[PDB]
Amino acid sequence: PVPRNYNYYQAPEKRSKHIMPSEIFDDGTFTYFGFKNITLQPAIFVVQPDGKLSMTDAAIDPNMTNSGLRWYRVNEIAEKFKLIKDKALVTVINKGYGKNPLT
């Protein structure tokens, strides 16, 4: 068992609701993005300090069934993610970044 940082929020662009996760948390090593079965799967990118984007090391975790969602494990902790599928964009903010997962 590892205390989780659940302190994330999403900021969808227009015509972007169809790619939004329902649950996002990190355990200090990995960031987990849970999507409803009905949601289309975006790519997940991280914002770098330069303002530029990077790919992540992301993949479906078949084992995880939490909340009836489709879960992706990202092998990184970051302050900002961009979820992209064609013109659809959701910015994810880790408000708990640099903080301990006690609170």
Author numbering: 1 to 103
Q: Which of the paper's sentences describe this entry?
A:
The T4S system of H. pylori translocates the major effector protein CagA into gastric epithelial cells. As an essential component of the cagPAI T4S system core complex, CagX plays a critical role in CagA translocation into the host cell. CagX is presumed to be structurally and functionally homologous to VirB9 from the well studied VirB/D4 T4S of the plant pathogen Agrobacterium tumefaciens, although the two proteins have low sequence identity. Here, we report the expression, purification, crystallization, structure determination and analysis of the C-terminal domain of the CagX protein (CagXct).
